[PDB]
Design an enzyme around this catalytic site. Sequence first.
Site, PDB file in Angstrom:
ATOM      1  N   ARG A   1      -8.027   7.412   9.311  1.00 24.57           N
ATOM      2  CA  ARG A   1      -8.275   8.867   9.330  1.00 24.57           C
ATOM      3  C   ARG A   1      -7.022   9.707   9.057  1.00 24.57           C
ATOM      4  NH1 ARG A   1      -5.679  11.674  12.465  1.00 24.57           N
ATOM      5  NH2 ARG A   1      -5.141  11.221  14.655  1.00 24.57           N
TER       6      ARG A   1
ATOM      7  N   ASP B   1      -2.547   1.902   7.274  1.00 21.34           N
ATOM      8  CA  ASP B   1      -2.105   1.720   5.894  1.00 21.34           C
ATOM      9  C   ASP B   1      -2.243   0.308   5.397  1.00 21.34           C
ATOM     10  OD1 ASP B   1      -1.140   4.461   5.698  1.00 21.34           O
ATOM     11  OD2 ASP B   1       0.341   3.741   7.185  1.00 21.34           O
TER      12      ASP B   1
ATOM     13  N   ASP C   1      -0.836  -1.605   2.014  1.00 18.35           N
ATOM     14  CA  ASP C   1       0.009  -1.487   0.827  1.00 18.35           C
ATOM     15  C   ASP C   1       0.033  -2.799   0.110  1.00 18.35           C
ATOM     16  OD1 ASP C   1       0.682   1.118   1.286  1.00 18.35           O
ATOM     17  OD2 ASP C   1       2.324   0.578   2.653  1.00 18.35           O
TER      18      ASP C   1
END
Length: 154
Positions: free
Chosen positions: A82, A91, A93
């Site tokens: 959120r 996150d 990546d």
Amino acid sequence: TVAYIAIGSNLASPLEQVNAALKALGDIPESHILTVSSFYRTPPLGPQDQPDYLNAAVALETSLAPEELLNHTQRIELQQGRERWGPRTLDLDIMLFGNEVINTERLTVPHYDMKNRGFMLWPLFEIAPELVFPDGEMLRQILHTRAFDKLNKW
Ligand SMILES: CC1(C)Nc2nc(N)[nH]c(=O)c2N=C1C(=O)NCCN1CCC(SC[C@H]2O[C@@H](n3cnc4c(N)ncnc43)[C@H](O)[C@@H]2O)CC1
């Protein structure tokens, strides 16, 4: 192809969130988890009052194209998460994507800033100590050169 993915969250209690993301990554089509790093507790890169972060790395075997894998990671972050200097609900990546070098509007691989982030490099070195980047740099060399502090487990 093997992709390496970094995961971070700094909810005050992030374990349920990280396990949800990990289950979601495993459920990605034409893909499966090879290995997961230990869970690491890292001091906030950013303002020092917010909650400690949980970082980890994942080796994901996949037949997806690089931008397709990104479509899935953005989706998982939206569904499970959120902002800027934290907090970060979740996150994901893409650190590496096989030996591929990618420089597009959406996607830069190797990840543009991981060479500077011990909370990215150390978990990765746990699961892929021999890793060589597409340009011939060595993960081990990067950690030796920079002397980033080792991380405490969660
Ligand atoms: C607050 C901060 C700095 N402090 C931290 N302190 C600790 N201790 N630990 C942490 O963990 C930690 N994290 C932090 C953080 O804030 N990470 C976001 C990085 N991160 C950027 C990319 C996207 S968010 C922007 C954009 O980047 C694009 N992107 C381009 N290349 C890539 C690529 N290889 N992988 C993925 N996304 C790509 C993507 O399309 C998106 O629109 C997903 C998430």
